[PDB]
Design a binder for this molecule. Structure first.
Ligand SMILES: N#Cc1ccc(COc2cccc(C3CCN(Cc4nc5ccc(C(=O)O)cc5n4C[C@@H]4CCO4)CC3)n2)c(F)c1
Length: 390
């Protein structure tokens, strides 16, 4: 199994709660002059009779606490009833030598750097592409409207991941000592974390639905449904931007009401998470069906003409490589390779690898459908010919 600082802090939470409960639930000694019990971010020492040490077993939240489960952290208090002071008047003396001791933290830090650079290339490419597709009035179709909505979806997704990773600065605090673990959990179980992480869940689902809209619109062009345009366009924008709210807010309400701690991370024994991951899988499967049907149409269309041995293969390969970015069909590979029962560091390493590869779908789309496009080059040439005369 894989453990990291995440699991250590999660165990520390339970240890602190348990020791804090036993701190008051423990009956006080009848005699006096005793040394006062406490919990000082490392272990919960009990009352100690004066003139001798206190022998607490090694805390069990430590990653190495199982190798030697008989070491004792040693502390001494004076026979007058005072914890022994260390030199230079610091925290009371305690002996720690008994129990004491690439990695997933560095791994996660590198996957994070590649993913931020990619989502930051995709953001730049798509903002320039949206500007170009909005500037010229000759590029106003309905398919271009769908493209602009898709680009807006990608930009919103890439802006949400930056807000999650710079709200909580986990990329500096991955080497935190004991005295900072309260400030991590305190921020975790707050409301700002919950809302910043629920916004990300909606911006991730809108992005899959605006790729189901692309697929369905292409299919309805090729399956000859020429229904009333205004009804069709309003229906498409609706299914794009407002269907997520049909499975996000039920999840966002059950998690709010029924959970006491945490920042809406996957629950241990329950399975509340299916309200978000079930429709995403549904949309991925449907878009895969649309992809295979459209390829089945294109292959016959180019088989109908007169072509050599290698030109059909070249054209089919080029068409497929052009269509995988728009319909997001690489997700079906990613959905199979992801374990949906892993929690913690295992889950955070599987998810970040997908996000490193699927972070530059937005640059790929913006370069395939706004820069190597024929008509955009044509419009640039037309505008430069006129500006030549002044
Ligand atoms: N308590 C606590 C604590 C413990 C350790 C550290 C620092 O060390 C370590 C070690 C391993 C991994 C990590 C980071 C790994 C990930 N991020 C934040 C984060 N991105 C997420 C994306 C998707 C999901 C998901 O479920 O889909 C959930 C996501 N989560 C976890 C929670 C959920 C909102 O944020 C949290 C930390 N950090 C600390 F900063 C805080």
């Amino acid at each position: 199994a894989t453990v990291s600082l995440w699991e250590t802090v999660q165990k520390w939470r339970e240890y602190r709660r348990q020791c804090q409960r036993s701190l008051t639930e423990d009956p006080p000694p009848a005699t006096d002059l005793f040394c006062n019990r406490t919990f000082d971010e490392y272990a919960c020492w009990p009352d100690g009779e004066p003139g001798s040490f206190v022998n607490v077993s090694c805390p069990w939240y430590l990653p190495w606490a199982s190798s030697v489960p008989q070491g004792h952290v040693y502390r001494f208090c004076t026979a007058e009833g005072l914890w022994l002071q260390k030199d230079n008047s610091s925290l009371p003396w305690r002996d720690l030598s008994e129990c004491e001791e690439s990695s997933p933290e560095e791994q996660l830090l590198f996957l994070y750097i590649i993913y931020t650079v990619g989502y930051a290339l995709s953001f730049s490419a798509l903002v320039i592409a949206s500007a170009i597709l909005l500037g010229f009035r000759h590029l106003h179709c309905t398919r271009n409207y769908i493209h602009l909505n898709l680009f807006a979806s990608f930009i919103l997704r890439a802006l949400s991941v930056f807000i999650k990773d710079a709200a909580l600065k986990w990329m500096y605090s991955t080497a935190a000592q004991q005295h900072q673990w309260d400030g991590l959990l305190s921020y975790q179980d707050s409301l700002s974390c919950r809302l910043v992480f629920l916004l990300m869940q909606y911006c991730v689902a809108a992005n899959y639905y605006w790729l189901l809209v692309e697929g369905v619109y292409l299919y309805t062009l090729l399956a000859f449904s020429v229904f009333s345009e205004q009804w069709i366009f309003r229906l498409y924008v609706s299914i794009g931007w407002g269907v997520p709210l049909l499975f996000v807010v039920p999840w966002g309400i059950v998690k709010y009401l029924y959970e006491d701690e945490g920042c809406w991370t996957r629950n241990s024994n329950m399975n509340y998470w299916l309200i978000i991951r079930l429709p995403i899988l549904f949309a991925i499967g449907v878009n895969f069906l649309i992809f295979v049907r459209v390829i089945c149409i294109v292959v016959s269309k180019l088989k109908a003409n007169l072509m050599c041995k290698t030109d059909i293969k070249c054209r089919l390969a080029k068409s497929t490589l052009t269509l995988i970015p728009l319909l997001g069909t690489h997700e079906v590979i990613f959905a199979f390779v992801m374990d949906e029962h892993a929690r913690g560091t295992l889950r955070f390493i599987k998810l970040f690898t997908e996000l490193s590869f699927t972070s530059f779908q937005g640059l790929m789309v913006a370069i395939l459908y706004c820069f190597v496009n024929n008509e955009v080059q044509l419009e640039f040439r037309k505008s430069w010919e006129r500006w030549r005369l002044e």
